[PDB]
């Protein structure tokens, strides 16, 4: 499986490792694929690059 996550810059390495652990677990549960099988990429951007609920986002402050 391949997973991508687009989100604002600013998350810590700790938060990113927690995110990948959670996502790999849920994909493995659903598909039967082992974590070694399950590629993940985070694509980061400035706040102005994201529009949610009709509005551009501020930069993410940790």
């Amino acid at each position: 499986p391949m997973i991508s996550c687009d989100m604002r810059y600013g998350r810590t390495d700790e938060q990113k490792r927690a995110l990948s652990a959670g996502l790999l677990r849920v994909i493995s549960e659903a598909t039967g694929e082992p974590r070694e099988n399950i590629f993940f990429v985070i694509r980061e951007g400035s706040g102005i690059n994201f529009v949610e609920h009709g509005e551009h986002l501020p930069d993410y402050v940790p």
């Binding site: 499986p1 391949m2 997973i3 991508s4 996550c5 687009d6 989100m7 998350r11 938060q15 927690a18 995110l19 652990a21 959670g22 996502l23 677990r25 849920v26 994909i27 549960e29 659903a30 598909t31 070694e36 099988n37 590629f39 949610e52 609920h53």
Partner: protein
Amino acid sequence: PFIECHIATGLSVARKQQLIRDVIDVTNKSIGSDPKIINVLLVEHAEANMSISGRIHGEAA
């Protein structure tokens, strides 16, 4: 965040819905994102259309 999950065809519709629920939950738990700003797309592909770690027919290239 916008999470796109590329997986092989085969899951039941109910299991697809549980997967999306699960993705929302672990994203919220890990990075704190309000479920209201979490967007998820499940994309299903023929196994033949996917290569993980260079494998084709289950064997590395």
